[PDB]
Amino acid sequence: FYILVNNNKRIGIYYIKLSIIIGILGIVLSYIIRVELYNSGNRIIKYDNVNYYNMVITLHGLLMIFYIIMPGLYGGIPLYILPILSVITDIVLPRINNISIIIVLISYIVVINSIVIEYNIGTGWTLYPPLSIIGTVIVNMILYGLIIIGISSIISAINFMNILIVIDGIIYVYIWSIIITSVLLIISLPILNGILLMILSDIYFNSIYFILNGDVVLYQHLFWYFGHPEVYILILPAFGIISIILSVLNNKIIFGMKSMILAIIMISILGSIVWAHHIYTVGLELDTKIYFNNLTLIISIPTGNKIYNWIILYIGSYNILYNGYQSLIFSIMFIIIFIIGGITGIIISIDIIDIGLHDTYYIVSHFHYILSIGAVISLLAGILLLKDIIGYYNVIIKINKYFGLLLFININIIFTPQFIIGFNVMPRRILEYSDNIIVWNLISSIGSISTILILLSIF
Amino acid sequence: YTPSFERGLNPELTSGDYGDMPKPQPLIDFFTQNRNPWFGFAMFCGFNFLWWAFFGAWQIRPLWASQRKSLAEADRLYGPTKYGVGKKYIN
Amino acid sequence: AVRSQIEAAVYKWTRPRPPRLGVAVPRSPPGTGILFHTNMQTIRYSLSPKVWVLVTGAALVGVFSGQRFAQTVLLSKNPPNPPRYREKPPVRHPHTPD
Amino acid sequence: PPTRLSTPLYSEGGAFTVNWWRNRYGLYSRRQTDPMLAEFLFRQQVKEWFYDVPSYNYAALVGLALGILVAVIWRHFLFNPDVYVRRQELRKMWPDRHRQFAYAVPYLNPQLKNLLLPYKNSFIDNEPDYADYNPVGLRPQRVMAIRRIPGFFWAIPQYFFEDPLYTSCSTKNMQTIYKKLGYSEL
Amino acid sequence: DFPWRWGFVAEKPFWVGAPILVLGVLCLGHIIQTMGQIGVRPKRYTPEWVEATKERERAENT
Amino acid sequence: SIFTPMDWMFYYFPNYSRDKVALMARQIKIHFAIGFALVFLVYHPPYKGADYGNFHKSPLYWYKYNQLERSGQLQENLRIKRDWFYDEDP
Amino acid sequence: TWTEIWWEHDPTPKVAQYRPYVCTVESGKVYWWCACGESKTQPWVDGHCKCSKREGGFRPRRWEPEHDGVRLFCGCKSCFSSPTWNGGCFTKWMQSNPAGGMLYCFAAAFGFGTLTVYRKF
Amino acid sequence: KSYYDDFKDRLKPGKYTQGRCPQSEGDYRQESKTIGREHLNDDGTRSKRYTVKEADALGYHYHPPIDKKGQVYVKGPNTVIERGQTWIKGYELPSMEYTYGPKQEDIPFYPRVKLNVWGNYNLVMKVEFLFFYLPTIIVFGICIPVYTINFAQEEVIYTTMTVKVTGRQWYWVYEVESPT
Amino acid sequence: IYEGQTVQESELIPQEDDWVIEETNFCLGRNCYVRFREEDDLARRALHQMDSQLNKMHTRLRDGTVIPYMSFHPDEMVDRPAPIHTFSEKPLLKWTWDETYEEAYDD
Ligand SMILES: CCCCCCCCCCCCCCCCCC(=O)OC[C@H](COP(=O)([O-])OCC(O)COP(=O)([O-])OC[C@@H](COC(=O)CCCCCCCCCCCCCCCCC)OC(=O)CCCCCCCCCCCCCCCCC)OC(=O)CCCCCCCCCCCCCCCCC
Ligand SMILES: CCCCCCCCCCCCCCCCCC(=O)OC[C@H](COP(=O)([O-])OCC(O)COP(=O)([O-])OC[C@@H](COC(=O)CCCCCCCCCCCCCCCCC)OC(=O)CCCCCCCCCCCCCCCCC)OC(=O)CCCCCCCCCCCCCCCCC
Ligand SMILES: CCCCCCCCCCCCCCCCCC(=O)OC[C@H](COP(=O)([O-])OCC(O)COP(=O)([O-])OC[C@@H](COC(=O)CCCCCCCCCCCCCCCCC)OC(=O)CCCCCCCCCCCCCCCCC)OC(=O)CCCCCCCCCCCCCCCCC
Ligand SMILES: CCCCCCCCCCCCCCCCCC(=O)OC[C@H](COP(=O)([O-])OCC(O)COP(=O)([O-])OC[C@@H](COC(=O)CCCCCCCCCCCCCCCCC)OC(=O)CCCCCCCCCCCCCCCCC)OC(=O)CCCCCCCCCCCCCCCCC
Ligand code: HEA
Ligand code: HEA
Ligand SMILES: CCCCCCCC/C=C\CCCCCCCC(=O)OC[C@H](COP(=O)(O)OCCN)OC(=O)CCCCCCC/C=C/CCCCCCCC
Ligand SMILES: CCCCCCCC/C=C\CCCCCCCC(=O)O[C@H](COC(=O)CCCCCCC/C=C/CCCCCCCC)COP(=O)(O)OCCN
Ligand SMILES: [O-][O-]
Ligand SMILES: [Cu+2]
Ligand SMILES: [K+]
Ligand SMILES: [Zn+2]
Ligand SMILES: [Zn+2]
């Protein structure tokens, strides 16, 4: 059979396959954006059809996060190797594992069908009210997808937590990363469901939470209470993969295993109580802003320890071993890229600096370096490491120095200018812009078209 | 390109019979890769990408000569007064 | 001539003494010679602590001495700003309706 | 860390000790099925986690972060005027909430604000004392600090009396310049 | 075991092919996006409009 | 302990650190109190810290201050360099 | 200094040259590198040195290029990336002549400081 | 040498694209009629009947493997008795040339070496300490500036003029006090 | 931290003056994509794949003992590609201790 299969390793493959398929739509949406931003004036989107652009950015953000990266890093690799890293045979809850991947597909079909049938309007991937609750039915459809996706995420989190009961070996660092990510989902998802229901209530049940005398900022607190743990849920599995790749490909025992494990735990605890650095410009109390700013900076301490522990893993490795394997290059590239993304995150953590850089392309570049480069490269690196175990072929990616170099150069061309544009300044979620920002936007656009061409070379 | 034989700091250690094994060469060969024209083309290439990445494409300047001149005149005639070396810069 | 004397003096003073091992290892049996071969994974050649300091110290002097050289010879100081005189602003904004 | 089960582990009395940890570690464990095996696994975990020197660094960090977290939460409820828990003031119109207004001024003047506000001149180059004077009296009059903020502020001199232009850029001098022209009052 | 395209590329030295590919890919990207705007001449980029902006900047001391 | 490598704590204070589990708890408790104390003793106290007439002047302050005071730099530094907007055009 | 002061049970090479040997190499051909510094066909084994005779722990070092080109080969016989050169020849020279190393490092540092300061300033 | 030439003979270039003739010439979709291959298609792939339509996991072709005595066939080891001892000779995998193709000669030498481990416990602990507190010191250096700038934003100022700004879709409305 | 096994001086004394560390090659050989035979059907290609497993390979020392393929994690212990059912017999994680009981010995 193909749909009835409960084998966890098969389901892991399905997660990877589905993420690539949905990735194409996400890439298409991303390509539409940079083509439009090539220069001032409409290029592929009519001025009378600006609503479509708002939908493109809204779906680009939603699909890439919930439908592409999260299934790939939290559903794909973990379902394949996690029961193997544990001494157990298969996943604890086989039937739940089957329904989780099916749920992800159905939610994807609902989302894309809504593009085709409903009027195309957008409110951003964060769905801030009141804009989200004064829109058309496409917003209702997107909410159903998120709620449905939430069901799959929570049941998958329950599945991984049960490994603690049955694990017959040692809890490796990678296993810890998945377990702690599951803990974050369990504590953050129910809060997300509650606020999403309130959005539906206003949209569909004549609720008045998001009109005058009802604080709209209420949504931002509850949403970001899940929002920031989500970004840490995306990256923590990537950290686990990097730890395995560096140790395995260098024949070096992981240094400071317990320090690595405690760093992951510390990040989750801190990541659950710093959500309001997304709300600096709303006008919070003085003491509130100081607290979140102070605690946000503290997240760098555990994150820094992991970076240094990774570096010493690569240092001193035997020279005779060939170092040009794509998996090793991607793992090393992650350290270089993540540091850039994290440092810029610390810059925008300072709230007064953030006043100028909120809702600008500097924030875009910040999370693209971490997610579009780092997370993707970590997912690529893990899949490459498991090529023999997974057994896929008909691609030239294992030893391809051209692909690694071209990818690194061109992605940096896309997003380095966006840091510069942030100070110029160019707002986010914008289709037109002043003529004097064209040069930097043009350079990034040339970077985007180049990256897409490179992907065709792997086949 | 029939490269030369560099004996080295200690000529005695390069005094044996090399047979078919390659013989040591001057260091200039390494930087030219034995004057491979494609290394020299890929070399001219290397400098172009570097230049674009740090200073922009200066190969478009010959086509931008006429429109740059008009921009310079506009700044001098109508733009805010420049002082000293500031006159050298036009936005 | 002077270079040779100073070169010899630094060479003699920098010859390393046996390390004070920070790990618990046995004493090699007396009369034990070479047992391994050159195909073993290469072990990086590391400078002794004295040599590392001297070389590293020289670079620090070089880099900052070069910085001072550029600032005093290659670069120039700002001349005083031009005097500020009362000027006539434009009569009208170019977009003022007529 | 002993390597023989015959040698006992020293334990203190209290709610977080070796004995306290042993009693609870194996409550949910399927692997600690007999004394010998249970002790071996218990000492294995204790050795791996509690005898790891770098682990104690994270223990300090979680304590500090949680301590701040609890204090800020508690401070808002206790002192923030805008936070209501009792209902007496919420049953009256705004002008009648006299008891709640008592929190306003003291909550507006925390110690740290008074200490650090004078150090604005480490950031602002021109007129760092533009907002120092306020005749209303809700806050103290501010006086610029005499030293730079410790840390990463190497751009400015260590003390402001070393800067030849510091006094010329003060709000007082600029006010003198513009008043001489009749340009503005401030 | 590889198609012609990879056998051709993988035969050359990496630092011979790599710099050429980087330049080539960037040039192709620029050319592709320039196709849709051949001969487009907005008025705001004409010399007359450029001068007017300079007049505005002088008046506004931008 | 604060800013202390615990290997030093293990070595120099064996009896105190004999119970590692208890030692870990004290590490958490001690740093919890510090964080709690900072908010309510350093930040919270109202109407305090406004005695700007009592700025601390460390010995390094006086060393540099006296050095410039001895010469004319201190007087020159404090002098207002410019108090007019426009220069006179000849 | 691993062989010199730390470990006395690994073979210790003789420095043939404190500079790399430039050689043209061909893909699909195997080369043998002298690890003792006494071969007369440097940087390759000549058939008469210790490496060729398998004497005193010295053995030839197998090497094969991926692509055709000109490559640098270790002459100091202690480069971490041996047979290929990575700069260990200069490092090992500084150990032998630390006074000279200071002069070179100072000069290199001086140039780097001037250029970096001049451009940024 | 070129190792590909050693096993060139084994690799005969293919005839059909993707390894199959057109279904009209040969119907690879049908189940094979060869005895003992009823579970396979003609081209060798597993038949849909075997894997889907009549899958044993669904109750088709019920055949318990275990026998009455609770035993299943097990292949014994290759035992040898010599020197007054019973020995077992392990099964060695075939030469990698047979499975992969390249001739197993001129293999580069990779010696045995034990794990590369960082030593000097005392030194290592200090490095771990620095990894934690060097970032902490940097954070402390930022903290004081952060407090100061936050206070500057919220400082109470003696403003003399008020401008009210209202955001609407999609324009800005400004309300100002008209002079008397 | 782990710094290798502890060694006593007596353990380093050789029984002959000509002893040197054995030069046994731990490179398993030259490999590439597993190359199947067109004549082999699905069943026999499966046998071919099972006979090309690197994790079933080892290096035999001079005393007859073998150092096998080893990995830090059990992910490298299953057949490549991973079969449907991997760990039919539970992998054993061997711990060591100094405890002993009399029943195991005989005098
Ligand atoms: C009290 C009141 C009472 C009221 C009573 C009222 C009753 C009402 C009843 C209501 C319920 C009705 C439904 C009941 C279901 C019953 C299930 C059951 O028991 O089945 C047994 C039955 C067993 O079958 P069988 O009879 O033994 O025969 C099976 C075969 O012989 C061989 O066996 P097999 O299982 O191997 O074969 C199946 C499989 C075999 O075929 C294959 O698998 C083909 C090979 C793979 C090719 C590569 C595919 C791409 C990679 C995907 C990777 C991820 C896969 C994840 C796992 C699979 C998820 C489906 O083919 C399919 O079934 C189709 C596979 C589809 C894969 C989809 C992958 C993603 C596609 C992405 C699309 C991107 C474009 C976007 C736009 C389009 C969006 C739609 O199940 C099946 O095998 C068939 C299931 C068919 C139902 C599927 C329904 C899907 C609905 C989707 C939502 C559509 C809504 C929106 C429409 C929009 C259109 C544009
Ligand atoms: C701006 C000029 C642009 C020129 C156009 C571009 C031309 C192509 C250049 C390609 C270079 C590729 C190098 C290999 C990759 C690097 C990997 C690596 O480091 O590992 C090697 C190796 C590791 O062991 P391995 O196993 O043998 O190597 C593994 C490979 O990855 C295995 O990789 P594989 O299998 O592909 O094999 C690669 C193999 C074969 O490699 C090759 O085929 C490359 C051969 C060298 C070609 C260099 C041509 C330079 C042309 C400069 C033209 C300047 C004028 C431009 C116009 C200006 C107009 C104003 O590489 C080697 O044998 C390694 C040689 C050591 C690295 C040498 C890199 C520096 C070369 C000299 C650059 C000079 C730039 C001057 C700029 C002045 C501007 C005014 O050791 C090292 O890591 C080497 C340490 C670094 C040594 C070089 C230090 C830099 C040179 C001095 C400063 C130059 C800048 C001065 C600026 C002054 C401004 C006023
Ligand atoms: C004034 C108030 C006073 C109140 C006093 C209250 C007193 C309460 C006493 C409590 C005593 C607990 C005793 C049991 C200890 C645990 C034993 C255990 O689990 O046995 C294994 C047992 C399986 O039996 P087994 O066969 O022995 O297992 C063999 C191993 O798998 C094979 O593994 P292996 O042999 O390789 O390694 C052994 C060990 C290896 O692991 C360990 O040994 C870990 C040891 C440390 C654990 C933490 C202890 C507390 C540390 C101090 C924290 C103080 C914070 C103070 C804050 C104050 C603020 C005001 O494995 C495990 O422990 C596996 C389970 C780990 C679960 C972790 C879940 C995430 C929690 C966060 C981690 C802890 C972070 C602490 C802070 C870090 C920063 C400093 O596990 C299970 O039964 C699994 C059940 C899974 C259920 C999941 C769903 C639960 C519902 C979730 C709701 C949301 C949770 C949100 C969490 C947020 C986290 C950030
Ligand atoms: C004498 C020379 C000059 C000395 C200067 C001294 C300065 C003071 C330092 C202290 C004194 C040092 C004295 C050392 C004495 C020797 C001691 C010793 O033991 O010697 C033997 C010892 C070992 O000997 P051995 O064991 O025999 O092996 C020797 C081998 O050669 C193996 O050697 P190795 O393995 O040690 O090789 C080292 C190599 C190893 O490095 C790696 O392996 C790196 C691998 C990752 C590469 C990542 C590339 C970048 C990625 C960017 C991401 C975005 C991509 C965008 C793409 C766009 C599209 C194309 O390091 C590097 O390549 C340097 C990387 C430095 C960071 C790079 C990033 C700079 C960012 C700056 C801020 C930018 C702000 C921008 C603002 C706007 C624009 C202005 O060797 C050394 O210690 C060698 C040290 C030499 C280091 C020189 C590095 C210079 C780099 C300058 C960067 C300038 C940046 C300018 C822009 C600034 C803007 C603000
Ligand atoms: C995987 C995704 C991911 C990850 C890991 C992070 C990690 C971090 N993020 Fe990010 N972030 C996003 C995804 C992510 N973020 C997204 C998607 C948004 C925009 C959402 C939206 O608005 O739509 C965002 C937005 C965002 C904002 C602005 C929110 C707004 O106002 O709009 C800020 C502000 O501080 C921030 C901070 C941080 C910090 C401080 C970290 C830290 O974890 C980084 C820590 C890492 C380092 C610091 C580098 C490693 C450490 C060292 C090299 C040594 C120690 C360094 C120091 C002490 C400085 N993030
Ligand atoms: C995982 C998340 C993810 C990923 C990969 C990307 C990838 C890219 N994104 Fe981004 N993007 C977001 C998440 C992501 N993005 C979010 C959350 C926003 C904010 C939404 C909002 O404004 O509300 C955003 C916003 C955003 C904007 C701002 C829109 C606006 O405000 O007007 C732009 C503009 O160019 C952009 C461009 C790109 C480009 C050019 C790429 C890529 O082309 C970069 C290079 C990548 C490739 C060439 C494809 C590589 C392959 C994969 C990524 C799939 C791999 C799959 C597997 C391994 C299974 N993105
Ligand atoms: C949320 C409102 C729910 C109302 C419930 C009513 C029932 C009351 C009993 C149960 C709830 C506990 C609160 C009881 C309070 C009794 C005393 C009282 O009235 O206090 C009021 C006073 C403020 O009221 P006002 O005077 O109107 O405001 C002045 C300016 N801010 O309330 C408080 O300060 C107490 C409210 C908070 C109590 C809970 C504890 C606060 C700290 C939580 C820390 C959380 C972080 C983690 C802690 C870890 C601890 C191990
Ligand atoms: C039987 C099990 C019961 C479990 C119940 C659990 C309940 C809590 C679940 C999580 C939700 C937390 C409540 C949400 C708190 C929101 C507070 C908020 O947004 O307030 C901020 C101010 O809040 C703060 O100062 C931030 C404090 C951070 C609160 C975090 C609480 C939840 C933390 C959960 C982290 C995970 C658990 C950690 C456990 C210990 C780890 C060691 C807004 O301030 P202003 O808009 O300026 O208004 C001020 C006056 N006008
Ligand atoms: O979100 O960072
Ligand atoms: Cu965040
Ligand atoms: K546009
Ligand atoms: Zn030799
Ligand atoms: Zn060398």
User: Which residues does chain A have within 8 Å of residue D55's beta carbon, measured at their own beta carbons?
Assistant: 258-259, 262
Cβ contact (<8 Å) for C24 and I6?
Answer: yes
Query: How many angstroms separate the CA atoms of A379 and B31, rounded?
Result: 38
Backbone angles phi, psi at H178, to 5 degrees: -80, 135
Query: How many angstroms separate the CA atoms of A27 and A33, rounded?
Result: 10
The single residue listed with the structure tokens 């046995």 is C26
Helices marked H in D34-87: 35-50, 55-79
Q: What angle do CA A426, A432, A438 make, to 5 degrees?
A: 60
Query: How many angstroms separate the CA atoms of A228 and A234, rounded?
Result: 10
Return the structure tokens found at E9: 């590329």
Backbone angles phi, psi at I73, to 5 degrees: -125, 155
User: Which residues does chain I have within 8 Å of residue H3's beta carbon, measured at their own beta carbons?
Assistant: 30
Output the CA torsion D75→D78→D82→D86 (10° steps).
150
Which atom of ligand 9 approaches the CA of A345 most closely? 2
Q: What angle do CA D1, D4, D8 make, to 5 degrees?
A: 70
Query: How many angstroms separate the CA atoms of H89 and H76, rounded?
Result: 11
Neighbours of F50 (CB within 10 A): 18
Return the structure tokens found at A302: 């555990």
**Closest protein CA for atom 32 of ligand 8:** A273
List residues bridging with I100 in a β-sheet.
none
Q: Give the Å distance between the CA of A348 and the centre of ligand 10.
A: 10
Residues 6+ apart with CB under 8 A from G84: G63, G71, G72, G73, G74
| A232 flagged as catalytic | yes
Task: Provide the CB-side half-sphere exposure for D170 (13 A, CA).
Answer: 19
| CA A206 to chain CA centroid, nearest Å | 33
Q: Give the Å distance between the CA of A41 and the centre of ligand 11.
A: 4
User: Which residues does chain A have within 8 Å of residue H152's beta carbon, measured at their own beta carbons?
Assistant: 352
SS3 of A387-403:
HHHHCCCCCCCCCCHHH
Query: How many angstroms separate the CA atoms of D50 and F27, rounded?
Result: 12
- Yes or no: say if A399 and A326 are a contact pair by the CB < 8 Å rule: yes
**Closest protein CA for atom 42 of ligand 2:** E15
Query: How many angstroms separate the CA atoms of A316 and A310, rounded?
Result: 12
Nearest to G5 among C16, C32, C37 (CB): C16
The closest of A142, A173, A6 to A63, measured between CA atoms, is: A142
Q: Residue H124: CB within 6 Å of ligand 1?
A: no
State the smallest CA–CA distance between residue G5 and chain H in angstroms.
17
| C36 DSSP 8-state letter | S
Backbone angles phi, psi at B87, to 5 degrees: -60, -20
H144 interfaces chain D, CB cutoff of 8 Å: yes
Return the structure tokens found at H43: 């081209």
Identified catalytic residue from A100, A114, A181, A243: A243
Q: What is the DSSP string of I12-70?
A: G--SSTT--------------S----TT--HHHHHHHHHTT-GGG-EEE-TTS-EEE--
- Yes or no: say if D46 and D18 are a contact pair by the CB < 8 Å rule: yes
Angstrom resolution of this structure: 2.2
Q: Residue D72: CB within 6 Å of ligand 3?
A: no
Neighbours of F12 (CB within 10 A): 10
The closest of C7, B27, C2, C20 to G94, measured between CA atoms, is: C7
SS3 content of chain G, % helix, strand, coil (to 5): 35, 15, 50
Q: Give the E-side interface with B, CB within 8 Å.
A: 12-13, 15-20, 22-23, 26, 47, 50-51, 53-55, 57-58, 61-62
Return the structure tokens found at D53: 């020197």
Q: Which chains touch C (3 or more CB pairs under 8 A)?
A: A, B, E, F, G, H, I
State the smallest CA–CA distance between residue F88 and chain C in angstroms.
7
Return the structure tokens found at A357: 């850089």
Please state, in angstroms and as integers, the Cα–Cα distance from residue A317 to each residue in A250, A251, A252, A314, G11, following that order: 6, 7, 8, 6, 21
Query: How many angstroms separate the CA atoms of F84 and F80, rounded?
Result: 11
| A40 flagged as catalytic | no
Query: How many angstroms separate the CA atoms of A328 and A332, rounded?
Result: 6
Q: Give the Å distance between the CA of A310 and the centre of ligand 7.
A: 45
Neighbours of H70 (CB within 10 A): 6
**Closest protein CA for atom 82 of ligand 2:** G86
Query: How many angstroms separate the CA atoms of I97 and I107, rounded?
Result: 23
What is the b/e burial string over I70-79, where b = at least 16 CB atoms within 10 angstroms of the residue's CB?
eeebbbbbbe
The closest of H125, I38, C17, A318 to F7, measured between CA atoms, is: H125
Query: How many angstroms separate the CA atoms of D164 and A457, rounded?
Result: 62
State the smallest CA–CA distance between residue E16 and chain B in angstroms.
6
Q: What angle in degrees, to the nearest 10, is found between the helix axes of A137-161 and A50-62?
A: 10
Q: What angle in degrees, to the nearest 10, is found between the helix axes of C49-69 and G98-120?
A: 30
Give the nearest chain E residue to C94 (CA atoms).
E56
**Closest protein CA for atom 9 of ligand 7:** D85
Q: What angle do CA B61, B62, B63 make, to 5 degrees?
A: 90
| A428 flagged as catalytic | yes
User: Which residues does chain I have within 8 Å of residue A89's beta carbon, measured at their own beta carbons?
Assistant: 85-88
Backbone angles phi, psi at D52, to 5 degrees: -85, 115
Does an H or E element contain G33, and which? Answer: strand G31-33
| A306 flagged as catalytic | yes
Please state, in angstroms and as integers, the Cα–Cα distance from residue I66 to each residue in F73, I19, I29, I62, following that order: 82, 20, 16, 9
| Method of structure determination | cryo-EM
Q: Give the Å distance between the CA of B40 and the centre of ligand 2.
A: 13
Return the structure tokens found at G87: 């700069």
Answer left, alpha or beta for residue I14, where phi above 0 means left and psi between -120 and 50 means alpha: beta
Interface mutation vs chain G, best among B6, B30, B39, most G CBs within 10 Å: B30
SS3 content of chain H, % helix, strand, coil (to 5): 30, 15, 55
- Yes or no: say if A96 and A158 are a contact pair by the CB < 8 Å rule: yes
Identified catalytic residue from A9, A38, A40, A90: A90
B2 interfaces chain G, CB cutoff of 8 Å: no
Residues 6+ apart with CB under 8 A from D84: D90, D100
State the smallest CA–CA distance between residue E25 and chain G in angstroms.
23
Query: How many angstroms separate the CA atoms of C55 and C14, rounded?
Result: 11
User: Which residues does chain G have within 8 Å of residue H108's beta carbon, measured at their own beta carbons?
Assistant: 62
Identified catalytic residue from A153, A247, A372, A378: A153
Identified catalytic residue from A230, A280, A327, A344: A230
User: Which residues does chain A have within 8 Å of residue I87's beta carbon, measured at their own beta carbons?
Assistant: 87-89
Nearest to H109 among G28, G30, G62 (CB): G62
Q: Residue A25: CB within 6 Å of ligand 1?
A: no
| A386 DSSP 8-state letter | T
Query: How many angstroms separate the CA atoms of A426 and A432, rounded?
Result: 10
Does an H or E element contain G88, and which? Answer: helix G88-96
Q: What angle in degrees, to the nearest 10, is found between the helix axes of A8-36 and A438-455?
A: 150
The closest of E39, D130, D23, A349 to D32, measured between CA atoms, is: D23
Query: How many angstroms separate the CA atoms of C52 and D100, rounded?
Result: 68
Cβ contact (<8 Å) for B16 and G23?
Answer: no
Output the CA torsion G111→G112→G115→G117 (10° steps).
-120
Cβ contact (<8 Å) for F5 and H125?
Answer: yes
Please state, in angstroms and as integers, the Cα–Cα distance from residue A192 to each residue in A159, A277, D76, F66, following that order: 20, 18, 25, 63
